[PDB]
Amino acid sequence: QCPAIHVFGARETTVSQGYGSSATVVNLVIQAHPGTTSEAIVYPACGGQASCGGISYANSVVNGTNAAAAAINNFHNSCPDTQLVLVGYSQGAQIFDNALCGGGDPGEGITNTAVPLTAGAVSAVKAAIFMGDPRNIHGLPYNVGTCTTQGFDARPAGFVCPSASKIKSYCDAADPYCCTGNDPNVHQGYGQEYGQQALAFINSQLS
Ligand SMILES: *[C@@H]1O[C@H](CO)[C@@H](O)[C@H](O)[C@H]1NC(C)=O
Structure with missing residues (x-):
């Protein structure tokens, strides 16, 4: 039978195939809710x-x-009544950002602005947690953190994500990727710093 909730996890750069640092929030949802399954984006x-094949x-x-x-689309087709949760870390947050919000990603060669998710899939996604998203830019309504600048693939100032109310994007000032910081360690500690907050948001979003 289909799960009540299903979580998609996307890892950070250079980490071997799996959940990577997205594991923290993914595990929190699984443990807190019976009937919750998950999968990592390949x-x-x-x-x-x-180390990762030399792919740019x-x-x-x-x-x-x-x-x-x-x-996300394929899973929704198999299980249309299942509530979906996305958890992306670093580059993982970027691919989920592009897929859920669309708007293109010119810095990485993506010019299409349409949301690649189906209408049914979008309505099934209840919450999305982004940690260390390089597409970050200060001012977005779903932002959480001390960062007041932007990341290397910063979204437009005043960007409007169609599913803005289903997201929480964590990013601190010292992060060198999602912000203009210089401390790589800050980029790696979001699971511990905001993990519980993320879970609380996901809990409020879930039906
Ligand atoms: C994307 O990369 C994965 C390996 O990480 C590979 O299995 C898959 O075929 C690639 N997809 C496309 C559309 O090239």
């Missing part, structure tokens, strides 16, 4: 490193965005 999660960041985001859209 994509390169690379930035030119030989742009090609990783291009593949990832499509992989994310295909996984």
Whole structure:
């Protein structure tokens, strides 16, 4: 039978195939709700490193965005009544951002602005947690964190995501990727810093 809730997790760059740091929030939802299953998005999660196949960041985001859209759409078709939750970390947050909000990603070669998710899939997605999203920019209504600048693939100032009310994007000032910081460690600690807050949001979003 189909699960009551299903969580999609996308990892950060250079991490081997799996959930990566998205695991923290994914596990919190699974443990807190009976009938919750999950799956990790299968994509390169690379930035030119030989460790992850040598696939460039742009090609990783291009593949990832499509992989994310295909996984969510396909699962919804199999289980249309299941509540969906997305958890992306770093590059993982970027592919979910592109797939859910659309608006294109020019810095990575994506010009299409249409949301790749089906109407049914979009309505099934109840909550989305982004941590260290390189598409971050200060001012977005779903932002949480001390960052007051932007990431390397910053969204337009005043960007309007159709599903803005279903998202929580965490990003602090010292993050060098989702912000203009210089401390890489801050980028890796969102699961511990905002994990419980994320869960609380997901709980309020779920029916
Ligand atoms: C995306 O990358 C994965 C491996 O990470 C691969 O299995 C898949 O075939 C790629 N998808 C496309 C559309 O190229």
